[PDB]
């Protein structure tokens, strides 16, 4: 869906290519870890945040 809708400009498709993120799990955890360094990486408190 993201590549069907947000795909009329090379900006979006090029940012999509170099994303390196695949899986809402991986993504969510990446941001969870990012926000606060060195913290308990429980997915419950991630969806909470």
């Amino acid at each position: 869906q993201i590549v069907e809708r947000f795909g009329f400009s090379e900006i979006m498709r090029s940012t999509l290519e170099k994303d390196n993120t695949v899986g809402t799990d991986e993504a969510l955890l990446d941001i969870y870890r990012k926000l606060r360094p060195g913290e308990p990486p429980t997915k419950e408190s991630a969806q909470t945040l």
Binding site: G38, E39, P40, T42, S45
Partner: protein
């Protein structure tokens, strides 16, 4: 599952003590939080009359709590009327440093 140190206020050790209990009953934490012994000193205040012997905290500001793990525990014990935080930030606090394997008895005995 072992013992942990908790920081209170100077003047709220027994209010915290009572609160932790009342809260352990007014929430539903009888399968998590366990005994909460604030180290006490029964130093007989000799008076030959009206006696003024009291708790006279040995560690003004700290209260020892025997709890379980997880995070709910943490939240309930920290958000109590009269506490200041935890004790054990010897490296991020990820694994809150517990009292050395054999150290509880050295306080509970006396």
């Amino acid at each position: 599952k072992n013992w942990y140190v908790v920081h209170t206020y100077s003047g709220y050790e027994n209010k915290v003590k009572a609160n932790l209990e009342k809260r352990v009953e007014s929430m539903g934490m009888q399968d998590k939080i366990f005994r909460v012994v604030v180290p006490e000193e029964e130093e007989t205040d000799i008076k030959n009359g009206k006696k003024k012997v009291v708790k006279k905290k040995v560690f003004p500001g700290y209260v020892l709590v025997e709890i379980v793990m997880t995070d709910d525990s943490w939240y309930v014990v920290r958000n109590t009327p009269g506490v200041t935080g935890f004790v054990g930030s010897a490296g991020s606090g990820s694994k809150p440093t517990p009292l050395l394997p054999g150290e509880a008895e050295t306080i509970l005995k006396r």
